[PDB]
Write a protein that binds this ligand. Structure first.
Ligand SMILES: CC(=O)N[C@@H]1[C@@H](O)[C@H](O)[C@@H](CO[C@@H]2O[C@@H](C)[C@@H](O)[C@@H](O)[C@@H]2O)O[C@@H]1O
Ligand SMILES: CC(=O)N[C@@H]1[C@@H](O)[C@H](O)[C@@H](CO[C@@H]2O[C@@H](C)[C@@H](O)[C@@H](O)[C@@H]2O)O[C@@H]1O
Ligand code: FUC
Ligand code: FUC
Ligand code: FUC
Ligand code: FUC
Ligand code: FUC
Ligand code: FUC
Ligand code: FUC
Ligand code: FUC
Lengths: 309, 309
């Protein structure tokens, strides 16, 4: 056995250096980090890798950028009073961030997504966090905004209860948000300049899929992932138009995730992609995309070993 | 969500009064109790119902009898040093029992079973606890004995790694032990008077099934249960001869347990039977046998609600 909480949410980040970090919850409610550099074995995931804490079964999201102080990471979660909360890696240490002090109440079954653009050693970051206030069918998605200070943003959509949410900045100040609407279709909401509008993407999916989204490049390339636990992973790809969604699967390892589990995706470069899932073990696994090979299940991420094992 | 640890072991007891108790592990490693009287709703299962603690994913077993001091319960488990341990309900309170002081080392992946006969308001109890020392294929089952003081008993069998173990006293000082041998057959070891011998029962089963056994009456009646997580429950029945094993299932709720989960059974009277399993939720469920109706899935057993839900 491991210390990975069954039906923990997952969050993941990646940057060119390739450095990856993945966040998950342990049996004690702590948020742990595992790390990978290049194709070296994963490190971390132990009781010595706690970065924060949240209510048990808290949703999670994470973003990263490089700053003059080093690598910045923000991990979003919910506390035991269902208040939207944030842990900060400030380039050298983990601390509690300012978002928790705002008093944003989140629906108990809400998921979280986050995106960032612009942050660098010569420009400030722009963060957007997406959440729901209500658990019921037809609830909207709400946005909280950091472009110097936290303030409320938009609300949009009418969703399945506790919908998955994918969020990606496809270009500077250009946002795409993916969620599952009340007809069980994945839908898309878009910001290009001065307004939100309904996007052209849609796809039928199992009720209650976990959703993730990434993007890169100039077209830009967008990939939207969804998975119901113990069903195969799906990907929709945009390269100027949307393709027909396809399964990412391994005939020798059918539907490798456990029921009622979540996914997370990261990307960096042009292009490295990880899509994390939770399997028997309880284990943290991932799909990996490699140029010239395709998709495969990669190395297992360590998530601790309880005493007596 | 609940506070039921996913892939927790389960132990259950029942006595005529019908009182049931079921034991499971929570996310913090505590052993909790839920209670039922007659067909009234289940009670307990909360953080206020802790009876002991054990290593995370500890095996569990339990027995009960009535004494001059009240209802006696013994719950067997393993501590973080893999030492066989015991919690005592002494008729009025929960305390730590004497077995832990003996120093019986248990294999990390061992299951536990226990039986009792003879204990009453006019006779002392006789307890037997079954465990393994080694995790490997071909390991034996070992017995610890209470008939006034703890001492070692028999060792027998050659098992699948971490085999399920069922144990029942089919009559005064008459014992039947069920386990899965290295050929994946469920086998039977028997004590009637002065020696252990190989029983006539055998049945093919999926590798690694969770096993439970109960018995009652004068024939006697024996029932042996086995289940692999996310497969249907099986029962073999003895009423003078063994039947062909059959599935206990509900066409509207196929294979209702989660992968890699465990079962436990209780019985009392002539005859009431519960077979507990772990399902999505994470929930503690049970099959129930009712004279004139047959088998059905009964009321859900409460297993706590984490803060923020
Ligand atoms: C007056 C004020 O609020 N100043 C803030 C500083 O105290 C703070 O250190 C910085 C950075 O905040 C951290 O990073 C940003 C991007 C958010 O993630 C925030 O929640 C987090 O605390 O911001 C102001 O300068
Ligand atoms: C001298 C000695 O060990 N005496 C024992 C008592 O201290 C003890 O209270 C009783 C009962 O023990 C409890 O119940 C038995 C059936 C076992 O479950 C045991 O492990 C548990 O502590 O036993 C002796 O009289
Ligand atoms: C960017 C930083 O990289 C390593 O120093 C980790 O130990 C930190 O937790 C953080 O992820
Ligand atoms: C990029 C945009 O930034 C602010 O204008 C928000 O109010 C919008 O909703 C959007 O996030
Ligand atoms: C980048 C593209 O932007 C808009 O055209 C959307 O309608 C598309 O679905 C896609 O997100
Ligand atoms: C980066 C890759 O882009 C296209 O080749 C897709 O068909 C793959 O699934 C992957 O997203
Ligand atoms: C036999 C006893 O019954 C009730 O008093 C429960 O509260 C105890 O924990 C025990 O099961
Ligand atoms: C009923 C019998 O009791 C003792 O003799 C033990 O040594 C045996 O193994 C068996 O449990
Ligand atoms: C009660 C019966 O006892 C012996 O005959 C065993 O061989 C049987 O399988 C059964 O346990
Ligand atoms: C008590 C009952 O006995 C027989 O009727 C079996 O066929 C049932 O499955 C049940 O064990």
């Amino acid at each position: 056995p491991t210390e990975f909480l069954y039906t923990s949410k997952i969050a993941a980040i990646s940057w060119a250096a390739r450095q990856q970090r993945v966040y998950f919850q342990d049996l004690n409610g702590k948020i742990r980090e595992a790390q990978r550099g290049g194709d070296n074995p994963w490190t971390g995931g132990s009781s010595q890798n706690v970065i924060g804490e949240a209510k048990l079964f808290s949703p999670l999201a994470a973003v990263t950028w490089k700053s003059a102080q080093g690598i910045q990471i923000r991990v979003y979660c919910v506390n035991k009073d269902n208040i939207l909360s944030e842990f900060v890696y400030d380039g050298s240490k983990w601390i509690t961030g300012q978002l928790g002090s705002v008093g944003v109440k989140v629906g108990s079954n809400s998921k979280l997504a986050a995106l960032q653009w612009g942050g660098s050693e010569s420009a400030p970051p722009n963060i957007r966090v997406y959440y729901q206030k209500s658990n019921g069918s037809g609830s909207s998605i709400h946005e909280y905004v950091w472009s110097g200070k936290w303030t409320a943003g938009a609300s949009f959509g009418s969703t399945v209860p506790g919908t998955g949410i994918g969020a990606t900045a496809i270009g500077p100040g250009r946002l795409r948000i993916y969620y599952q609407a009340t007809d069980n279709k994945i839908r898309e909401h878009c910001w290009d300049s001065n307004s939100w509008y309904v996007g052209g993407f849609s796809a039928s999916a199992s009720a209650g899929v976990s959703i993730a989204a990434i993007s890169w490049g100039s077209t830009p390339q967008i990939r939207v992932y969804w998975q119901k636990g113990r069903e195969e992973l799906y990907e929709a790809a945009y390269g100027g138009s949307w393709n027909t969604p396809g399964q990412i699967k391994d005939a020798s390892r059918p539907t490798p995730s456990l029921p009622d589990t979540f996914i997370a995706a990261n990307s960096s470069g042009n292009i490295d992609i990880s899509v994390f899932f939770q399997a028997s073990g309880v284990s943290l696994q991932q799909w990996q995309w490699i140029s010239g090979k395709g998709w495969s299940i990669g190395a297992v991420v360590p998530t601790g070993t309880p005493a007596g094992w």
